Amino acid sequence: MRVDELRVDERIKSTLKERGIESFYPPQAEALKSGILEGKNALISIPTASGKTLIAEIAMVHRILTQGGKAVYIVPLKALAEEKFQEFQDWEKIGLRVAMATGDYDSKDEWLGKYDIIIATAEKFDSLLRHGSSWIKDVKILVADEIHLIGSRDRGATLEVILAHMLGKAQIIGLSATIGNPEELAEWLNAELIVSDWRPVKLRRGVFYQGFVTWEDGSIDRFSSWEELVYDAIRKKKGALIFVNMRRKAERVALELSKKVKSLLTKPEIRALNELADSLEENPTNEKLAKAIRGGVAFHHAGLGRDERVLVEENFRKGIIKAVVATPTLSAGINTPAFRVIIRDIWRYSDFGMERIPIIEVHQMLGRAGRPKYDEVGEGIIVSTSDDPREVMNHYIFGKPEKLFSQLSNESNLRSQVLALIATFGYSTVEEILKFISNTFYAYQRKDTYSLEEKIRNILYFLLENEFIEISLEDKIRPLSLGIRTAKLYIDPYTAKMFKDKMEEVVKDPNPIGIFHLISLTPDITPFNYSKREFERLEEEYYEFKDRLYFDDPYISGYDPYLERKFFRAFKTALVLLAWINEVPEGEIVEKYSVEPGDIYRIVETAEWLVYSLKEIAKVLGAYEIVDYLETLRVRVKYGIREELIPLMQLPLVGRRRARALYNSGFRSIEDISQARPEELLKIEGIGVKTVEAIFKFLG
Ligand SMILES: Nc1ncnc2c1ncn2[C@@H]1O[C@H](COP(=O)(O)OP(=O)(O)CP(=O)(O)O)[C@@H](O)[C@H]1O
Secondary structure (H helix, E strand, O other): OEOOOOOOOHHHHHHHHHHOOOEOOHHHHHHHOOOHHHOOOEEEEOOHHHOHHHHHHHHHHHHHHHHOOEEEEEEOOOHHHHHHHHHHHHHOOOOOOEEEEOOOOOOOOHHHHHOOEEEEEHHHHHHHHHOOOOOHHHEEEEEEEOHHHHHOOOOHHHHHHHHHHHEOOEEEEEEEOOOOOHHHHHHHOOOEEEEOOOOOOEEEEEEEEOOEEEEOOOOEEEOOOOHHHHHHHHHOOOOEEEEOOOHHHHHHHHHHHHHHHHHHOOHHHHHHHHHHHOOOOOOHHHHHHHHHHOOOEEEEOOOOOHHHHHHHHHHHHOOOOOEEEEOOOOHHHOOOOEOEEEEOOOEEEOOOOEEEOOHHHHHHHHOOEOOOOOOOEEEEEEEEOOOOHHHHHHHHHHOOOOOOOOOOOOHHHHHHHHHHHHHOOOOOOHHHHHHHHHOOHHHHHOOOOHHHHHHHHHHHHHHHHOOOEEEOOOOOEEEOHHHHHHHHHOOOHHHHHHHHHHHHHHHHOOOHHHHHHHHOOOOOOOOOOOOHHHHHHHHHHHHHHHHHOOOOOOOOOOOOOOHHHHHHHHHHHHHHHHHHHOOOOHHHHHHHOOOOHHHHHHHHHHHHHHHHHHHHHHHOOOOOOOHHHHHHHHHHHHHOOOHHHHHHHHOOOOOHHHHHHHHOOOOOOHHHHHOOOHHHHOOOOOOOHHHHHHHHHHOO
């Protein structure tokens, strides 16, 4: 159907045209006339090429202009908050103020109250609901994007709890990938179900093996080696997105391709890639990317920094980069389709042994094949090396996607959520906690939740014994200072426990390595991994600082190669964080501690929230003497700077490097910066014209 036919506020229709939309894809039409316009709940399960977002926006903005209030959009990761934030900007033109919310769990973020569209992660929104922000009752609609992640172990439970809290309290719209149980998820959400197999460009799915690609129609096409599929894509001026399981593999396979891909390029093309590779700050990770890019092939994974990944996604979408070998982790960032999508690996490293890539994911990767403007047909090829080609075809192509199961049974999120229900949503009887649970997706799918009730009761004993809660003088559960505080910090009740137990020791010896090692051993941070060749050196580093650690034993749980692992992962991480606050250059940190940019960025951001929560836990326990020290450690962790550089950090575009260049040149305070001519600041190596402009602009 056409835009204008949409019986919605005229201002929406206008924006859709100013964009470029005149008509809707069948799935969209079906969804837009499902009843979501009437404020009804709906589960839209259609391929991502089909425009799920647009449906949500129209629905959101509509609900908001016709009934006032706020529309909450839930994205999977912080990095995807920005993309959504940008593509939602045009709604400001019609009066709707848009905002992002992804961190700072320990805050009501009341400032958000003055906004009409809030883009937050499930975690951020969970925290906000815990803090009971006054603008929450204002929300008329919440869109759960990538809602199939509800069946995801690591974070699915959180997405479910926020949903269970919201059902019947606001409109709920789910945007998901094809699954095995849409009807079930829909009925739980008491929602209209929109299932469509429709997509913009035709998709051709095939399985490559021993030198041949068999498609779903039984036909065949010769290709010497799988990589011939790529060289073939480029010789036809098309793109190739190769999916791999490991970071090093992504890099190797990219370098290898590029060697042969350059010869299929042009003199102008080579030049564009050259200037491109010539625009990257030197590094062990950037060396590999550049050398590879100079051949039209780039790799993409979580180990690269935001700049570098954004640069690959963009120059790929722009056809400059001819191919991209990426890990499916931060994959989504590549909102960049491709003529041919090759799934190189179908067996990933499980957290137990070996497992095939879930069908749902294989479809999401394949469905990412075929660019609208350039292709009339996209080709998704699954490579089989061990498996039977006929079997691979049966599992993925002809077989339906796996069914989604609630992951509420996650002790981690469940411990955190049982305490929240008491510490922030006012639950005081076990009979009440099961009433909530009876309305969850877990209880929907199940005939009984008896096993869950048991977990919950044991969770209560853990919270009860660990002073997180108490059974009042009326035979009722009521939170304690430590409990509210913990639920509000959004840290896992278990990591808070770790903080309380070790508190005495931190008070006694408040040191960087000890604190960094402590938090790096918590369920709220994913430490740095290490290779066998880093162990030896790590062991020495360890003994050298054993006296400073609070958790001084790598084996209090056993000899499991995995326990000694977790502990040294935490220790290496603490050394990295030490060099970080110690102002060691990023290219140097990456080199010495054998770690990657994207990881440093992530660990640093999390460590800060953890050093902060450690400070807030110390407060609810009386350890007031380490509170100032911890706050100064928090601010140092946040920027990777020494104590004196702290006042300069409020300056725009001023990080570790520039703050030091300014301080070492005499400008130690904001007052020092103010009483200065631009000529002076520009003489300092590292402060360019754009920085001085932002700085003086900041100073009035
Ligand atoms: N009716 C329409 N007409 C033309 N283009 C449309 C459209 N609806 C959506 N699109 C476009 O199709 C593509 C949308 O990709 P986007 O990644 O934002 O959404 P999605 O459908 O993949 C769901 P999500 O992002 O939540 O997975 C974009 O290029 C967008 O501009």
